[PDB]
Ligand binder design. Sequence first.
Ligand SMILES: Cc1cn([C@H]2C[C@H](O)[C@@H](COP(=O)(O)OP(=O)(O)O)O2)c(=O)[nH]c1=O
Ligand SMILES: Cc1cn([C@H]2C[C@H](O)[C@@H](COP(=O)(O)OP(=O)(O)O)O2)c(=O)[nH]c1=O
Ligand SMILES: Cc1ncc(COP(=O)(O)O)c(CN)c1O
Ligand SMILES: Cc1ncc(COP(=O)(O)O)c(CN)c1O
Ligand SMILES: [Cl-]
Lengths: 350, 348
Amino acid sequence: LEKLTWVSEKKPDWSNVQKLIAACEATNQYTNIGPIISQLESFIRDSFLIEESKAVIVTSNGTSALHALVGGINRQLGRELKFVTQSFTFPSSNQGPLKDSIIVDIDEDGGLDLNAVKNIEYDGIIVTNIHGNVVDINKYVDFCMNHNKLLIFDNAATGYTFYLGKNSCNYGHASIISFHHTKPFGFGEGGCIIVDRLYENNIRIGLNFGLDNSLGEKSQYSNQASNYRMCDLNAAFILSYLQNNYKKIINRHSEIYEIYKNNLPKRFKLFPNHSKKNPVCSSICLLFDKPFRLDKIPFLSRKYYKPLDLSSPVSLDFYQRILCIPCNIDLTDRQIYEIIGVLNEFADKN
Amino acid sequence: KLTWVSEKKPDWSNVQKLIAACEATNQYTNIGPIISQLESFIRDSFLIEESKAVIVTSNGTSALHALVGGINRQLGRELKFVTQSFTFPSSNQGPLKDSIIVDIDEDGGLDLNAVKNIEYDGIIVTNIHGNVVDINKYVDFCMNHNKLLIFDNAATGYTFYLGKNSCNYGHASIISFHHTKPFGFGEGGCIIVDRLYENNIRIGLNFGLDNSLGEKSQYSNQASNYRMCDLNAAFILSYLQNNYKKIINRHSEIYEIYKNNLPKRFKLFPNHSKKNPVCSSICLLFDKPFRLDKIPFLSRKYYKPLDLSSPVSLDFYQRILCIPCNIDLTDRQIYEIIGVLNEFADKN
Ligand SMILES: Cc1cn([C@H]2C[C@H](O)[C@@H](COP(=O)(O)OP(=O)(O)O)O2)c(=O)[nH]c1=O
Ligand SMILES: Cc1cn([C@H]2C[C@H](O)[C@@H](COP(=O)(O)OP(=O)(O)O)O2)c(=O)[nH]c1=O
Ligand SMILES: Cc1ncc(COP(=O)(O)O)c(CN)c1O
Ligand SMILES: Cc1ncc(COP(=O)(O)O)c(CN)c1O
Ligand SMILES: [Cl-]
């Protein structure tokens, strides 16, 4: 267990990366949507099973995926949209165009508490599918349909979990994924928006300051936009990593979830998850039955997410009870069983 | 035939040797082993002063936004900046989405007359395409009125003012390493900033999360993901190692030809430097408004005013011609351009 790493060891396939970036070299186009962007967006669409009704839009990072998604929709609708995010999530959904988002608690199933938005003025909600686990997506889709609200899934850590027969990224108006090095599908930095086609053109123009190349000299910036595009260099490293490893990651991460599911240590439960098939997790998240401190676990382990608003009791209860265990393609079954042994010993003494 | 930028190709051997450091530790972002190498290269090669931090970011826009976000976090409020209309949209986006837009004066920078009766914390002055404003008039004004001063040097990485890189003036400046810039490769940015703000700006590239506080780290709503990936750092560092000297020298030599052979009724963009600027494009001003589609070679007008009601900014936009300036251009091509522009002056 001294050998545990958070992330599998990742190295460029240099001959493959050079083959991809040769198309940049040929045209001197390495950004502003060069020849690699379409290849990675196509690879994501076909490999992650994104539906035809959705755009696949790569961005510089998972954060810029969320911010470009919101910026683009704000520009299309002509106002700064007010979003609610859950406290039990990463800071990205209270930053950029979401810097004044309303923060509310989660319910005990891991997602934003729809009861907390009863008396609030807002335009949409952002629901986080934690570390590859999914919430009961239909209850958010129905709520947002009934109340004419936009629905975004923060799928930063959740690229290939299936809910009722399709990739969870295909639900709500939009979802985002992260290709940050720390993520299963990540290499360096990167993000992706999966979004209803109605907003696709404004979101793409929104990566380029709001400047529509189709208008030529008549293009006009939007104060809702920024520089949010993915560089073709980064697209090549991410595409090469996925071409060489995507299949092994989806299979092994499912195999790793399978061992914990069938061999749960005493007084630990799996994090709430609504997928029939095993999720593809960024870490294996267990909930101990009472608060505990990370320093009592003698192997590499973390707590996510530190609540954005400390006045959210369910979020804090989860933070206090969660254990996030490394989940990557370098982990051995021997290590998984030894981890389950250590948590059984921890359970005995606490 | 003309191109906006020079053909740029990775030195694969050198890029691989740099990224070998990432491969040995599996660290390719969150400040891997290349970031300090690029920031040191910039410090030494661009002649940044010891009183300044060099902070690499994902792009020139994120350099500006991370600079503002970091200072907002340190001062505990959302700072109100004024920017000039004759600039790129970055200074009216992100934390600057509600910046105040005023006109330029005829020397190419923010008109200090326009801010007399306005409430604001700071100004952003754009040094256009490698040309510099009268930097000390801004430095003195901001000292007298206790205002923050930022130079948008996105296109102005190596223009000197009173003996030192123009990036060393104001509280801070930013540079772009966008592929379209002389020093660029792919995407990238850099903040040059007073050390007082260095720590909060570096933490603000990481959502405001200070890895020094361990589990006590607390995010800022003024921050984001603004860091430069080590992969990009390697491609930018390799390109600068192999080319920065050739670029500075050839861009100066290109400017020399235009300065000494100005086409009729064209003037050099206002430049307060006593040395030739290192330009992202050669910016000429015609004596009257004209349409780009009358120029029969690759050319642009930067910048379309952010506020089209700023009359000097709109006049500059209507009269400007931005001509390619890169190390692939031959002297023969430059004299051909000046020939076509003499013909344009005759016909217009
Ligand atoms: C982004 C990029 C642009 N260019 C060229 C294309 C154009 O002639 C010129 C300007 O590109 P452009 O995309 O117009 O930049 P902007 O919209 O900010 O003006 O640079 C390249 O050669 N390579 C690249 O990677
Ligand atoms: C950024 C990065 C992190 N890591 C490892 C270091 C840590 O053990 C783990 C998490 O990184 P960390 O920097 O803590 O990210 P976060 O703030 O999202 O938790 O990933 C890599 O192995 N490679 C990388 O390029
Ligand atoms: C839930 C969530 N949302 C957004 C992000 C931001 O992704 P990136 O790090 O690629 O900006 C993260 C990554 N920490 C995340 O975990
Ligand atoms: C003056 C100015 N400011 C900021 C930027 C933004 O830099 P980047 O394209 O690297 O985001 C640019 C790029 N055109 C610029 O010209
Ligand atoms: Cl000078």
